[PDB]
């Protein structure tokens, strides 16, 4: 055999296949690591940037509204529904079976002062914003896929699985809210 | 290497799992060693080595 580039092992020597596979696996480690690194670098370049994450927390104060009405206030893209429910509205929202509710929740565990309801106005189905004083439950109707919410912001019929999200609100005085 | 061959190279599924494990563990080990070299080469220059850190009036 030509021996300028390679020198043979003595004839009858055991094959070097195992050593060869062992050696090749070392570089295979590196190839797999490199591929993983490059793909994950592209996937994570699509994730939220630092300037975006720097704007994900704040607080805003508010006042008072007349009964029977609803005001849509702002934050960082999640509007907040605030409604002053009348006594008849409170009574209507306290005469329903808990078992029939898709998401079992009580009126009291969703309200601090029974004269006000502060919820995030984003449909739990797919992110749309429900219409006030619409639907067949006196609360909110979502125009996207027909999700229906009641006085307490609870889902009754439609595709949305959960009730309206309740943020952290409080009353510093008679006419001052804060989120 | 024939003993290791009889456990890792007999089936391609085991061999592929071995390559994945080698990538994981070897990259972790190299990362650790590189970070050790970096720390040993930059003693005193880290943010955590600022004498007055926390002491801005």
């Amino acid at each position: 055999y030509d021996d300028h580039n390679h020198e043979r092992y003595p004839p009858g020597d055991p094959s070097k296949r195992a050593f060869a596979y062992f050696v090749l696996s070392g570089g295979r480690f590196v190839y797999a690591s490199v591929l993983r690194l490059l793909v994950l670098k592209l996937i994570v370049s699509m994730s939220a940037s630092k300037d975006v994450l720097a704007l994900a927390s704040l607080e805003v104060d508010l006042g008072s509204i007349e009964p029977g009405t609803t005001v849509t206030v702002k934050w960082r893209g999640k509007p907040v529904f605030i409604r002053r429910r009348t006594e008849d509205d409170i009574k209507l929202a306290n005469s329903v079976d808990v078992g029939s509710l898709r998401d079992p929740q009580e009126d009291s565990v969703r309200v601090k002062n029974p004269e006000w309801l502060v919820v995030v106005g984003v449909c739990t189905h797919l992110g749309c914003i429900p219409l006030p004083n619409a639907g067949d439950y006196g609360g909110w109707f979502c125009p996207c896929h027909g999700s229906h919410y009641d006085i307490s912001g609870r889902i009754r019929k439609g595709p949305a699985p959960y009730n309206l999200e309740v943020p952290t609100y409080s009353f510093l005085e008679e006419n001052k809210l804060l989120i | 290497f024939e003993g290791f061959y009889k456990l890792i190279m007999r089936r391609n599924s085991v061999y592929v799992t071995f390559i994945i494990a080698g990538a994981f563990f070897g990259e972790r080990a190299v990362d650790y060693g590189v970070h050790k070299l970096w720390e040993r080469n930059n003693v005193g220059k880290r943010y955590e080595d600022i004498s007055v850190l926390g002491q801005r009036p």
């Binding site: 993983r36 | 089936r11 599924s13 085991v14 592929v16 799992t17 994945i20």
Partner: peptide
């Protein structure tokens, strides 16, 4: 009775690869 063993081996390989790409140690 080798296709089942091949399926088990490749399932182990797929699991190992999953834990390796996503590395969910802070979630488990």
């Amino acid at each position: 009775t080798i296709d089942i063993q091949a399926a088990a081996g490749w399932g182990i390989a797929a699991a190992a690869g999953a834990i390796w790409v996503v590395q969910p140690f802070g979630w488990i």
